[PDB]
Ligand binder design. Structure first.
Ligand SMILES: CC(=O)c1nc(NC(=O)[C@@H](C)NC(=N)N)sc1-c1cncc(N)c1
Length: 130
């Protein structure tokens, strides 16, 4: 309905704002753009489903997220990809892992503090009805 599309529009507005706050954080610059295959050749074969904050923005705008659970699955994908690609004990790997976990924790913390549980529940019930 028209009411329901207003609901999803509010969700998109909320998700753009959260994603922008993540993308301007200096700690998360490594996650703001897709991995360039020319710079990193072994990536595109180790990570089967790349995800980054710029691609998150595109998906918001393509109306791919109808719930924040859908959005958090891509945030979690950004994190788990980073952990999978950087499993070694060396400092570079361990710095990226720390930032990946901080990206995840920050996203979950903003949503917990700022997204009304009933708003998300409404989003899920509209989704489950389609
Ligand atoms: C996405 C990601 O996790 C990532 N990890 C990296 N790790 C490394 O460079 C070293 C420390 N570890 C290793 N095992 N290669 S660089 C990198 C990345 C590559 N291209 C573009 C963007 N933005 C990020």
């Amino acid at each position: 309905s028209m009411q329901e599309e207003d609901t999803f529009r509010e969700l998109r507005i909320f998700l753009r704002n959260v994603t922008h706050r993540l993308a301007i954080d200096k700690r998360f610059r490594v996650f703001t753009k897709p991995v360039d295959p020319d710079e990193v050749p072994d990536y595109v074969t180790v990570i089967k489903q790349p995800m980054d904050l710029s691609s998150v923005i595109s998906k918001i705008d393509l109306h791919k997220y109808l719930t924040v659970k859908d959005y958090l699955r891509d945030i979690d994908l950004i994190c788990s990809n980073a952990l999978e690609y950087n499993p070694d004990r060396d400092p570079g790997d361990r710095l990226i892992r720390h930032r990946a976990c901080a990206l995840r924790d920050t996203a979950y913390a903003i949503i917990k503090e700022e997204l009304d549980e009933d708003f998300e529940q409404l989003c899920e019930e509209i989704q489950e009805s389609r």
